[PDB]
Amino acid sequence: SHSVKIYDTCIGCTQCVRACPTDVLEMVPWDGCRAGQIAASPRTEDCVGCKRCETACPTDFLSIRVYLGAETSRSMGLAY
Amino acid sequence: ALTGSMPKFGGSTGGLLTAAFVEERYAITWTSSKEQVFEMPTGGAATMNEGENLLELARKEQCLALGAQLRTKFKPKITDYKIYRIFPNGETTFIHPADGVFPEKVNEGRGYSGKKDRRIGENPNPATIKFSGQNTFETDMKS
Amino acid sequence: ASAATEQSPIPTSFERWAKPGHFDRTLARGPKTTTWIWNLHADAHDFDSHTNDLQDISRKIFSAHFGHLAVVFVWLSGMYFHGARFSNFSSWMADPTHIRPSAQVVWPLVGQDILNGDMGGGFRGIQITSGLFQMWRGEGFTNEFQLYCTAIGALVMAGLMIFAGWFHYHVRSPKLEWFQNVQSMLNHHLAGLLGLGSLGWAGHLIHVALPTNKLLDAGVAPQDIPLPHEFVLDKALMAELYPSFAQGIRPFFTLNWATYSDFLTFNGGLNPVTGGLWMTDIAHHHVAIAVLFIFAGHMYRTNWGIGHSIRTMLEDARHPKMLPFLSFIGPVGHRGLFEVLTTSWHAQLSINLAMMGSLSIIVAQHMYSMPPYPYLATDYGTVTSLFTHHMWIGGFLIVGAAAHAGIFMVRDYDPAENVNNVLDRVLRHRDAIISHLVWVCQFLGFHSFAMYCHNDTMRAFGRPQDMFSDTGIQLQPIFAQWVQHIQTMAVGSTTAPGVASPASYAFGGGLVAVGGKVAMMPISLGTADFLIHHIHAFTIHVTVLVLLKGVLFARNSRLIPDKSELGFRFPCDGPGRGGTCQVSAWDHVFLGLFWMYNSIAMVIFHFFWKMQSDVWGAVDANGTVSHITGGNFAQSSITINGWLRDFLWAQATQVISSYGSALSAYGLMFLAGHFVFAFSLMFLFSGRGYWQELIESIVWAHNKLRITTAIQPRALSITQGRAVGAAHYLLGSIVTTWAFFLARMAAIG
Amino acid sequence: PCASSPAFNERMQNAPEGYYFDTPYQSYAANLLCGAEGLPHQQLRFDRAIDVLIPFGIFFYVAGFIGWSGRAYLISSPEETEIFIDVALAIKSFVQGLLWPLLAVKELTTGELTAPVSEVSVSP
Amino acid sequence: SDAYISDDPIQPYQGNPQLGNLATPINSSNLAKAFINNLPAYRPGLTPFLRGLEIGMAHGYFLVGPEVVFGPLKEGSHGANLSGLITAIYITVSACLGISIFALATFQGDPRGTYNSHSRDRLRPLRKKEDWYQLSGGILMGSLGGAIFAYALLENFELLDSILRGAVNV
Amino acid sequence: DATQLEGAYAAAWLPWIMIPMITYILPFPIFAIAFLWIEREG
Amino acid sequence: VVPNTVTWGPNVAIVMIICNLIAFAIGKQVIQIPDAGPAPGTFLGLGLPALLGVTSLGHAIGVGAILGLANIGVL
Ligand code: CLA
Ligand SMILES: CC1=C(/C=C/C(C)=C/C=C/C(C)=C/C=C/C=C(C)/C=C/C=C(C)/C=C/C2=C(C)CCCC2(C)C)C(C)(C)CCC1
Ligand SMILES: CC1=C(C/C=C(\C)CCC[C@H](C)CCC[C@H](C)CCCC(C)C)C(=O)c2ccccc2C1=O
Ligand code: SF4
Ligand code: SF4
Ligand code: SF4
Ligand SMILES: [Ca+2]
Ligand SMILES: [Cl-]
């Protein structure tokens, strides 16, 4: 499975969550930014590694990083 | 156990294979107000029935591609789709929406599962976690 | 006004020229980085992205067509002017067997006038291989003033074509209902463009070309020949040549057509004098196809009840109305395809590019074997250049067909429109199509190329009895040999009693030699020809695999289920799912460009070597033919080593030993093509992040000198690096072959 | 020398004349240094010191002209002056670009030709 | 609208349109099924050894010929038939070693893919490793025997020829 | 002269059997052993 | 060498007329007949488009039949 890490430079714009094709990410309350939200990655067993969440992130540097890890049949995107 | 009519479809070569029945299958259910043509994520055009529809797909990404098509390519939008994971013993598990809202909104009760209170440029540099097993983000400090 | 279909806006403004990117909303933002500069020319003509109305796009396309026609007329004007001012056309008209065609002289600048070679007759110029002289001789030109007149007419037509494109967009542009009239368009193009065009050309041939060519073949000097209008004017002069013109246009209306059988002949061979086809036989061809195309133009219902409706014919081709074994296409059939083809310009462009490239390839294969112009077959450089050029144009056009079949999929395909029809049913079993194409490509790759590797190993072992040769294990193409035998039996004094000679001497028949050199002779098909035709089948099939795979999986696949949301030209979808690099349809057009190169290069190599060892040569007084390379295709072209030694190493003697001669530009361009091929590999093997990280250090060195620029320097994008690498590979690798072919054929004839 | 070279005359007295070998084989043979193959070899000696200065030193002027016109045009700028070359400011940076040799030594001593280490972006 | 509303020759596989196959005349006609389902791989009721035995007999028989006609020994009859025989022998032993190691690697616990207990593949009915070992033994026996039967018919081709021309009735 | 492979060296019957063993007799057993080693389950 | 082909005589006009009438007999069974334009159905069922199409196919059939019959002696 890949590791998706969310850092405190997150601004809760939700764009990483909206860009995820496999529903790894969701928003949780934070009170660490003024949106009141921060991304989280519980279903990271579903992560394929497309890094659409990283492309959608506006902060410099990214508040979300995907580290490609051990490949499973889900992270390899195999329908066979 | 899952309610819904299979969408009217002629079949394709892009559908379920062995791994669907030996590893895992996914199902997406949705209610449509009219009988109308959508695009299968497996290739082709199917027709959703008026009422409750249930479709088995091979990947969760296919079920989420269909769901994104339902809520964006149709007026009125179909936003009530539910995605389940089916196991070879028959066990069905409701996965999407994980909570019951929709990941893009914020629910009180979800909980942190990837948060690292840092700022990326301050992970522990790899010279110190060498023969440990941890790699640089699965840690706890900040250097 | 005459059809009430115009009233177009878009006033001719000048201010809209100093604001690049005005067509795209993000292109008119404000540059910022350098990617904008390259994005400006990446979708400049893509009128589909710019706006959303089909009618505005259709109007833009119509005026762009007019501007393109203007560009082609400017090119034609330039070619006729070059033949009328900087050519030895008159000298070649006098002696077209000892004079080399030339239509380009080089200015006396640095070392530069060495490229002006002696062309015979004291003319110092460059030997052209475009076949313009042989074409003008067949059309009826005798002096350069007529060429100058044609150049002026083409320039006037170009000005007229750029006025018709401005008047059909800025003054009175058509409505969308006019563009969607495919019945009327097909009727007019079939009857008025092709039918009347070939009828008018048949009139020209019967009254200008046939006279002039008959006197030329008789022996008359080019300026001793009457001008074409005298052939038109007095019927006594024209009746000296033909005795069927004494009865005028009377036998035609009274249906006594065998009266006309001396200028409408049906001989079907080659003129022994010139080497080209029988000119009377050509005129009869154009008369017959004019009658066929005009008659074909009355097929589609337009405003008068009679005719077909293509929508009805499309919607009825379906089960259970089909042939029983063709009934697998289901009960919808071709129902939604008339609305696909009348609302998508990309669908039409895909079909038309496929047919245009295929027809250009057919043109290439029909003009070496049935040489249609005087003294064409004996100028081997021209024959080589024409075949090679039309094969390359055909291959590029065919690749663009797949490109636009993929653009139709991502953009113009609507699942709700076409449900359970042939287009839906193809997308609904494309794994079967692609897997069977994968297997046939593998079968053909083992049974063509690995047989060549077998032959290499057997020849290096010293056991040529074990080879796939004509002296080892024979692989005779019995079906093509049988077709060749049927073609030479048909034309007997049979199944075609009207023709005297075979349709080409390539099938069989005799030998036509003109000026000592061979115009045409039978092309024997042995084991080497079996092997190279299966090479051709294999390469065409892998090109089809690469291109069709991108077309069929342009929407989605099992890997990326929402590929149509990503676009038609996108680099990847990240390093996940193992790494989805080059999954777009555009990347399949990228990879099929290489495969079209590899396919057409072997076709032009097969043609060059086979024609040079088994057709072209030098007939002596007795009749013995000494071929150029000496009939070494049947034993050297069956191994890879013989292709590298007896074709590439041996026949590149004339291009590398050309320094200091008049062919030295060919040696320079040979090396230049090698450079551009190798330089392409920098873009093809490397990736974008290296170059962006090296530009970081270069930007640091620039910031330190305070030479910072506002437009921020960025590396070429991923698909742009791919496009640049592909363009460079194709350009260098084709310039190399061009220089090799042309230096070889301009030195040994 | 090329005038007394025994192998340099077999390309003298057997070659096309034209206007590329007749008014070029002379001045060349008078003032070049050929070896044994009858070919002028570009030497680097004390006699070449006042010979190689006109390729080397006079190229340095035009190269610095281009580099200083590209500098003085681009300090006075802002992402539309690179697209649409402002001909007035281009002429202003050409007129100053003519005598760029002096201006270049009037920047190093003043410290306005180089940027500070903390005023230029770097990478990790 | 039209998506499985009209009745066409091409149906979903097993009536399930979400399966990755179609019911075409080549996998679903009565002639195609009558031929394929009665081939030894699929004939109902047979033990794996007899399936393998008939597969091997048919296979070792035709595998002799390509080297008899095309091999390095083809200039002489006796050596050509021997080269074809040992080519069939080597291909048989390699293929059966592959069958044995496929069964050894696949059937480890609950297998993965089509030989998992939950698999619905109708086209792969040898679900047990015992079936695969009986198949390997049968294919080996039958293929080596069919190869030497083709070899013996090619060695005695002069006799089989005089027999089938009635030259033995003098 | 050379109608077949020869050895003008000591124990020249050893290539005759060593080349089959190293190159087409023992390799497929070695491939099977390595395949069974890489596909064995925990 | 060439397929005979006669000039024009009462025998040629008969074949060209009998073939124009067969065209009329079979051209009554077309669809979208009497399609206005000019003389909307004033040609015994057919309009002017349908009459011109029927006579054009009749001329085509006549030229083909006449040249065939002239080739083989009958005409
Ligand atoms: C010479 C270089 C080379 C070779 C051998 C290949 C070979 C192949 N290409 Mg490829 N390609 C190449 C260059 C090459 N390519 C380059 C330079 C590009 C740049 C754009 C591409 C891009 C490309 C694409 C996009 C595709 C291919 C495809 C294929 C496969 C075609 C199917 C086939 O022919 O089956 C036969 C196999 C061969 C001809 C390989 C050589 C076999 C030798 C002769 C026999 C070996 C004997 C024996 C087995 C050896 C065993 C010894 C043991 C010790 C291992 C094939 C394996 C297509 C494919 O996948 O088809 C299904 C595919 O779509 N190629
Ligand atoms: C599909 C099909 C087909 C084909 C078929 C085929 C492919 C064939 C074949 C065939 C074959 C391929 C056959 C075979 C066979 C065999 C046999 C007949 C065998 C045998 C054997 C034996 C008898 C052996 C014996 C032995 C043993 C075992 C032991 C010891 C030794 C010996 C020798 C004694 C066709 C189209 C035609 C039609 C129908 C269907
Ligand atoms: C070399 C290379 C680059 C670098 C290439 C670049 C940046 C383009 C080079 C074009 C130069 C920079 C020309 C631009 C210069 C200005 C236009 C000035 C030119 C001067 C004229 C006006 C006279 C990539 O970006 C790249 C990306 C992906 C795969 C492979 C590669 C790759 O191989
Ligand atoms: S890499 Fe792709 S699948 Fe994984 S969290 Fe990011 S967007 Fe989702
Ligand atoms: S896209 Fe980036 S900033 Fe926005 S919610 Fe996701 S991690 Fe936070
Ligand atoms: S290597 Fe390049 S093309 Fe491939 S996945 Fe990574 S970014 Fe995309
Ligand atoms: Ca042998
Ligand atoms: Cl060889």
Numbering used by the authors:
A (entry chain C): 2 to 81
B (entry chain D): 2 to 144
C (entry chain A): 11 to 503, 527 to 782
D (entry chain F): 39 to 115, 121 to 167
E (entry chain L): 4 to 173
F (entry chain I): 3 to 44
G (entry chain K): 10 to 84
Reproduce passages from the article.
pmcPhotosystem I (PSI) is a plastocyanin:ferredoxin photooxidoreductase that is essential for the light reactions of oxygenic photosynthesis. Each PSI monomer comprises a central core, where the electron transfer cofactors are found, surrounded by many antenna pigments, chlorophyll (Chl), and carotenoid molecules, which are involved in light absorption, energy transfer, and photoprotection. When cyanobacteria capable of FaRLiP are grown in far-red light (FRL), most of the core subunits of PSI are replaced with FRL-specific isoforms.
To provide further insight into structural and functional relationships of FRL-PSI, we used cryo-EM to solve the molecular structure of a third example from the marine, terrestrial, and FaRLiP-capable cyanobacterium, Synechococcus sp. PCC 7335 (Synechococcus 7335). The cryo-EM map, which is a distribution map of the electrostatic potential (ESP) of a molecule, exhibits a global resolution of 2.91 Å with local resolutions ranging from ∼2.8 to 3.2 Å. Each monomer of the trimeric FRL-PSI model built from this cryo-EM-generated ESP map contained the following subunits: PsaA2, PsaB2, PsaC, PsaD, PsaE, PsaF2, PsaI2, PsaJ2, PsaK, PsaL2, and PsaM. Each monomer of the trimeric Synechococcus 7335 FRL-PSI coordinates 92 Chls, two phylloquinones, three [4Fe-4S] clusters, 19 β-carotenes, seven diacyl lipids, one Cl− ion, one Ca2+ ion, and 13 n-dodecyl-β-D-maltosides (β-DM). Thus, if the core subunits are assumed to be present in ∼100% occupancy, we estimate that the occupancies for PsaF2 and PsaJ2 are ∼30% and for Fd is ∼10%. Thus, it appears that B19 binds Chl f with high specificity in Synechococcus 7335 and H. hongdechloris but not Fischerella 7521, which is probably linked to the presence or absence of the PsaX subunit. In addition, and surprisingly, Fd is bound at low occupancy to the stromal ridge of PSI formed by PsaC, PsaD, and PsaE, even though Fd was not added to the sample, suggesting that Fd-binding is less transient than in canonical models.
